[PDB]
Amino acid sequence: WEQYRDRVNMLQQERIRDSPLLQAAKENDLRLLKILLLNQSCDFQQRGAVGETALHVAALYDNLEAATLLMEAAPELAKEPALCEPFVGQTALHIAVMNQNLNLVRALLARGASVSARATGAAFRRSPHNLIYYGEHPLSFAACVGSEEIVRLLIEHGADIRAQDSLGNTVLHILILQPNKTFACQMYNLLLSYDEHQSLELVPNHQGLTPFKLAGVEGNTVMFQHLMQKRKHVQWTCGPLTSTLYDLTEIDSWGEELSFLELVVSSKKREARQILEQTPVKELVSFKWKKYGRPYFCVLASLYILYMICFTTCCIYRPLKLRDDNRTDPRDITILQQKLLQEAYVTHQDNIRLVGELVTVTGAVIILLLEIPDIFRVGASRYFGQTILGGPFHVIIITYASLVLLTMVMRLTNMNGEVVPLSFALVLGWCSVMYFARGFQMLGPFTIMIQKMIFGDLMRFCWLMAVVILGFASAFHITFQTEDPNNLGEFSDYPTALFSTFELFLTIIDGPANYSVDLPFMYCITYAAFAIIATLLMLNLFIAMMGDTHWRVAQERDELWRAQVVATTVMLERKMPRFLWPRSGICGYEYGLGDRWFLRVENHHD
Amino acid sequence: WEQYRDRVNMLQQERIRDSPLLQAAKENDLRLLKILLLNQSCDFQQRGAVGETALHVAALYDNLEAATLLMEAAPELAKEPALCEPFVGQTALHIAVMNQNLNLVRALLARGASVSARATGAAFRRSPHNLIYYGEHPLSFAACVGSEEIVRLLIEHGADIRAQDSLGNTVLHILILQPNKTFACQMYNLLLSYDEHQSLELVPNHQGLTPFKLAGVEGNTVMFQHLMQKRKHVQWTCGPLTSTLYDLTEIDSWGEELSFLELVVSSKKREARQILEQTPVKELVSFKWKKYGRPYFCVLASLYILYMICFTTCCIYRPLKLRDDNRTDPRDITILQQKLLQEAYVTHQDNIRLVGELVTVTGAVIILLLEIPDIFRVGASRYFGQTILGGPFHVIIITYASLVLLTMVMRLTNMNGEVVPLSFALVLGWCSVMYFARGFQMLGPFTIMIQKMIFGDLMRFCWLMAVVILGFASAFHITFQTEDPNNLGEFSDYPTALFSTFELFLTIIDGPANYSVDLPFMYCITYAAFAIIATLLMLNLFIAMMGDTHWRVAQERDELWRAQVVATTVMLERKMPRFLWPRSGICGYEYGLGDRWFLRVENHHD
């Protein structure tokens, strides 16, 4: 996995140094090559540990002289690849192209090396194990390494550009996938110059991604503005300000089931939310959010708040009657019990409760009908793990809907204990109102800052906090086992000791002090220790740690909310009917432009 | 100490200016030297205050002419050192080499100055009193001062390199010990060029440190990477990425009892935890932590958590019975007492408690058998003072094991008062679970941030806080001595007044206010003063001070946790059996490299 690559590397070096031919081709000592090569006892077709030829060893260490006497001795040595596991099809042409030796590429293609060689090795895969991902073809290698004349000479000797390696990538896809974009745009432009017969730009992956859409997913913003340089038309310029006309064919993407914006905003990269601030996309989603996004999000926020008010009002009024059995046990304060279903609804007010119960059951099942096909559409790890798409809000709204239907089953079945799913349903359903805070600048970054602290600082405080609560709760319970529980009812047994220590951690309840009786001195010692450690330091160190966290990632949650507005915009018009959402942009059929649905911007550059 | 060096410096200057010969050699007036030196009444072998010669005075002030007429008048003046306390063996050659005057070194070694002169003075020692530590030999002086030609002329005239001064250092050790490493690597390479017969690089200190290990302890990272340029082999390079093969002979150090990593991570320097981020070491301890470190640490953490759950469960269930004597005294709430040992265990449940007591006694004694030989191995100040090695966790786990054994002695002896060592044992043993938080990125830096604020800000707040508690507790107790204790039981006598003022500092209990009675007005005045000073300012200024501390040293606790993971990794495989921990690296015997156990990395440099 990683020590297997190391093992096969030491085996490769060992079979290089054991063979005199391979080690002599590595050292580039020409006279000893002629001594062992003039004699016919040596084997020219001699393999390495990975099945590599001595020509591969000569191309590995930039040994042009060793390689050209190997080709002069045997001309066929170009036309064998390595045939082992990490290099299933790697030829000497791949090594010569990657090392950027132009004379070696010329002298190796002179004898007839295959330019369509497909190196399906484990090292030439898009994997986290490999440091680079340059392709399976020599032309992809020449485009990724950044050599212009090697690309031109590969076009001159065969090597059609429309060659797809594994995961469906052509050379344009892998040119976008490289970092260090100084030479990527010129290479892309030069292979678009030779692209003369569907075009090469529309060839997808095995995932189905256009190179435009792959640049959208990968966050290659420099390549994105380079691509929209070719997809734009400057209408006019008049002094300091110009008006230009971008094309929304590959951005809006009307006819495709998977659109460009859904692949952009639901990507796992830390980038590709800064590609939503580019020159067509930012004003496109800005017009889409101001014109239709924010009023519709406010409408669904208002009806969800009214639905929560209806659910809360149907929770407050409940079928509760007086209990039948008298309480002969002290410490029991239950005076009411929930009544049976046959006696629950005979009142006009119980019918008013019943129709609202039908409303909240209908709301729960339409929440499930809206949300379970999203779990079946995009994968559940990406659906629930993305804070851009409101993944925690999705899992708590599934939990709320399942708790409401569980409450409905317990209501028809007359099971006891409806207060537990009703209280979980009220807490989670009212906390699901926080999903609609993303539509406002005042509440959005604050809400995802809350979820950021919930994931980051709350857990790392709660583990250490639970350790301190367990230790001091054990001490508090074993300081008062000998004492009377009627004077200090806290720390009576271990669950209420653990809960009381949890409350005393947070300075919620007062310190247990009965001044009319004599308390143990060990309680005072361990409560001074609990006050110094947990009350004084740990709570205020959590305040200081959240301040230190809050000043650092404020820009991150600002741009995360800026992407979250786009996620809200593209979540709508995929669910809502199309007569609520007209097609964004300027229709080109009215002006004789060929129904491409452009978008005009006007910018002041001087 | 330091005013003795000042005193001997003024005595040195006084006996320079009292002597006409020494002051004339200092001022470099040639004719007055010829006048007093042509006459035979003057003494050529005339001492200073430190026993220095006039040749030493001429070499001290760069007086080449005074020194060469002193050597022409008397040729023997090179071959005497100073013979007093701060300079026991300092010659004029040491002063001439330190002042970097090449012509005086040539004219002084022409007359036959000793190149193997060993200056065992108090000024030439590795001490905090001395500003520099350049050695006892002129070759070490020439290497530390940074002169190439003086070094070459010293090797041309005797001066073997394998000369060890005090604390076992050769010239390479003291070349590593210097700061300002611009000329240190070239000097080290130049004396490794002259090293032609064990090699010089393997000569240790009197402490036993190799110069590789001394560079590891001292934190000389530039010298560390310069040393591992010579201990590495580049296997291949193919375009943008290369694969190279570092040697782990002096890094892993299998056969030695003291290994390189233990001397690195348990050093008292503020540096040498940034030497764990170097190219071989970070990859080696990263593989050692992912492959074997983290699963074994998680297994030990889960086993210790289950052991402490067993100790907590054996603490909750206790041999407690009803008390024999009735309580005729009010304010006494003790209703249970611990029973005798002969009546403690007759139940099946008491046997289930007894076997768990045997389990936690076995756990305490194996904690002692694992931890007391560590106190006997490395010194106790370094063992308990290092937050990298978990020193506070070590002293609280010794305290927990001793408290559990004291509880066992009190249980067999039937002493009363087991609740005090049981509660200290529960608090300290559950706080020892915080040791295992260092294996996770989420909990580790937070835990050593807690320890940092405990050492730094908690003490500096608690001294000031205890001052405020003492003053306001004295005022609160002397405001209510005239009043009824049955209405406000707090501030009754001075310990409960001190404790009540302590928990009123922290806003734990409510303010004492009985509205059914008339309180003193002076209590209201001094409680307003206590609320303004302690409640309002001091607590929130402690919050502000910990925020100001927390933003500054966040990267320090990040790199301290990064060293702490390496400390955990090297703490294991020293304690655990060797079949749990196989030898890290790639064995060179399988590939014919001579059993050196290398490690291969592959890096993308372009």
Curated annotation (Swiss-Prot), chains A, B:
Modifications the protein undergoes after translation, according to the UniProt entry: Glycosylated.
Outcome of swapping F393A: Decreased inhibition by the synthetic drug econazole
Description of activity control: Activated by WNK3.
Keywords linked to the UniProt accession: ANK repeat, Calcium, Calcium channel, Calcium transport, Calmodulin-binding, Cell membrane, Glycoprotein, Ion channel, Ion transport, Membrane, Metal-binding, Phosphoprotein, Repeat, Transmembrane, Transmembrane helix, Transport
GO biological process per UniProt: calcium ion homeostasis; calcium ion import across plasma membrane; calcium ion transmembrane transport; calcium ion transport; protein homotetramerization; regulation of urine volume
GO molecular function, one term: calcium channel activity
Tissues expressed in: Detected in kidney cortex, in distal convoluted tubules and cortical collecting ducts (at protein level). Detected in duodenum, jejunum, ileum, kidney and placenta.
Topology in membrane: Multi-pass membrane protein
Catalytic reactions on record: Ca(2+)(in) = Ca(2+)(out)
Intracellular or extracellular location(s): Cell membrane; Apical cell membrane
Chief location: membrane
Residue intervals on the Cytoplasmic side: 1-295, 377-387, 438-460
Segments on the Extracellular side according to the record's topology features: 317-353, 411-416
Result after altering D510A: Abolishes Ca(2+) permeation and Ca(2+)-dependent current decay; no effect on monovalent cations permeation
Top-level taxon in the UniProt lineage: Eukaryota
Keyword Amino-acid biosynthesis: no
Binding site for Ca(2+): D510
Subunit text: Homotetramer. Probably forms heterotetramers with TRPV6. Interacts with TRPV6. Interacts with S100A10 and probably with the ANAX2-S100A10 heterotetramer. The interaction with S100A10 is required for the trafficking to the plasma membrane. Interacts with calmodulin. Interacts with BSPRY, which results in its inactivation.
Name of the molecule in the record: Transient receptor potential cation channel subfamily V member 5
Gene: Trpv5
